[PDB]
């Protein structure tokens, strides 16, 4: 079974109006479970399974781990501006790290950093060295290698990350492993001698879905336009696939929805 843990960090100089400068969130199998912002200054759960399983000791302890990271990113925003020779303006520091438990049992650990949307420092678990993408990343590479900070980071991605992710999966066993059926609606619009058939799926879980258009029982790929898998505010997902067809052929077209919740692929039409 595939299980992933991802922690993303964002430090901004221009949030801007009525928004926190430091935002950081966590993900268990692509689902939002933990949140922290520079305004509230407290780690708040985002799922019911997270709050019901953890005590006050954990929530108070996690806040200080992030509070320290907030201070580090505050100093780094000023330190990096001096290296690039910048007086002010809009600048963003992004950090992405976590561990993935693959289907074949292999554990993959990653830690990447960026400045203004461009790669800065990428951790290599094999060679135990921090890779520099830009010439301004060399002083960070030199500093992090002498102090042997790579050993503590390797200990986290291989041990601390895996142990906690395995616990979070156990806490939300019924929530993460649930099957939610999508509500499918088919609507056609005729304009300039073109019939546009839209197939929309509402509120499904998990995230993977295969929505394909069929004409006379045969699948039509290249003509179909999709908007990908977009999320909902309650943890569910949404998707839309549109196809351009000749007017008077609408009845020949059928939308096929392939999802884990449905035992057999559901066939829908404009009716």
């Amino acid at each position: 079974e595939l299980h992933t843990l991802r922690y993303i960090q964002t430090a901004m100089t221009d949030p801007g109006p009525g928004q926190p400068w430091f935002v950081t969130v966590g993900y268990v199998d692509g689902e939002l479970f933990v949140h922290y912002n520079s305004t509230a200054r407290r780690v708040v759960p985002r799922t019911e399974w997270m709050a019901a399983n953890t005590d006050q000791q954990y929530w108070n302890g996690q806040t200080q781990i992030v509070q320290g990271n907030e201070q580090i990113d505050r100093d780094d925003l000023g330190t990096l501006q001096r290296r690039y020779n910048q007086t002010g303006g809009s600048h963003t520091v992004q950090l992405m790290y976590g561990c993935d438990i693959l289907e074949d049992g292999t554990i993959r650990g990653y830690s990447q950093d960026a400045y203004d949307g461009r790669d800065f420092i990428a951790f290599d678990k094999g060679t135990m060295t921090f890779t520099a993408a830009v010439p301004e990343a060399v002083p960070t590479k030199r500093k992090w290698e002498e102090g042997d900070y790579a050993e503590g980071l390797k200990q986290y991605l291989e041990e601390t990350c895996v142990e906690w992710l395995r616990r979070y999966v156990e806490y939300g066993k019924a929530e993460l492993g649930r099957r939610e059926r999508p509500e499918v609606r088919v609507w056609g619009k005729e304009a300039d001698g073109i019939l546009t058939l839209s197939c929309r799926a509402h509120g499904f879980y998990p995230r993977p879905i295969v929505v394909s258009w069929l004409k006379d029982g045969a699948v039509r790929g290249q003509d179909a336009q999709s908007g990908g898998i977009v999320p909902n505010g309650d943890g569910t997902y949404h998707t839309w696939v549109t196809i351009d067809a000749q007017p008077g052929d609408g009845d020949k077209y059928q939308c096929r929805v392939e999802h884990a919740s449905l035992p057999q692929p559901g066939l829908y039409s404009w009716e």
């Binding site: 320290g68 990271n69 580090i72 100093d75 780094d76």
Partner: peptide, 9 residues
């Protein structure tokens, strides 16, 4: 659990 950064850039 979040990783505690042991050093500044």
């Amino acid at each position: 659990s979040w990783f505690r950064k042991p050093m500044t850039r």
